[PDB]
Amino acid sequence: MKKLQIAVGIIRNENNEIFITRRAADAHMANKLEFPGGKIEMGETPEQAVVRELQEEVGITPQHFSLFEKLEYEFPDRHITLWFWLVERWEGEPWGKEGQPGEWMSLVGLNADDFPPANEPVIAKLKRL
């Protein structure tokens, strides 16, 4: 069974909205809502990975961010460690830089059922802020 380290960014604006993308229909966790992010590569740190992934996926450079949650999740065919970074300052304006759907979503309106099940405790903890 594959093992991966994944870094994702919770991109939160001043109006308590989060920038959320939707995964492709042929991806793992297909059609799910997601925090932008991706695999931490050999030779880069979790902090470097979340910067690079947000630059690639949505065209922003996160800065002065914090680790909101780190957790492990066993999917049916892979084990993933997820690093959830809270990103409240960034350079740029997030968009669907890889052609993927992305939009701002109110924190209070997030439905954990729309995301991979690994995100459940994070979405709950976010709504507690």
Ligand X SMILES: OC[C@H]1O[C@@](CO)(O[C@H]2O[C@H](CO)[C@@H](O)[C@H](O)[C@H]2O)[C@@H](O)[C@@H]1O
Instruction: Summarize the annotated binding site for Mg(2+) as residue ranges.
Output: 37, 57
Asked whether position 58 contacts ligand 8DG by CB under 6 A, the answer is no
| DSSP letters for the chain | -EEEEEEEEEEB-TTSEEEEEE--TTSTTTT-EE-SEEEPPTT--HHHHHHHHHHHHHS-EEES-EEEEEEEEE-SSEEEEEEEEEE-EEES----TTS--EEEEESTT--GGGS-GGGHHHHHHHHH-
Contacts to Mn ion from residues 21-40, by CB under 5 A: 38-39
Nearer to ligand X by Cβ, of 33 and 82: the residue is 82
Contacts to Mn ion from residues 87-116, by CB under 5 A: none
Phi and psi angles of residue 116, each rounded to the nearest 5 degrees, phi first = -60, 150
Asked whether position 9 contacts ligand 8DG by CB under 6 A, the answer is no
Asked whether position 28 contacts ligand 8DG by CB under 6 A, the answer is yes
Q: Please state the closest distance from residue 14 (CB atom) to ligand 8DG, in A.
A: 22
Asked whether position 6 contacts ligand 8DG by CB under 6 A, the answer is yes
Residues annotated as binding site? 23, 28, 34-37, 57, 119
Interface residue list for ligand 8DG (CB under 6 A)? 6, 8, 27-29, 34-35, 37-39, 80, 82, 116, 118-119
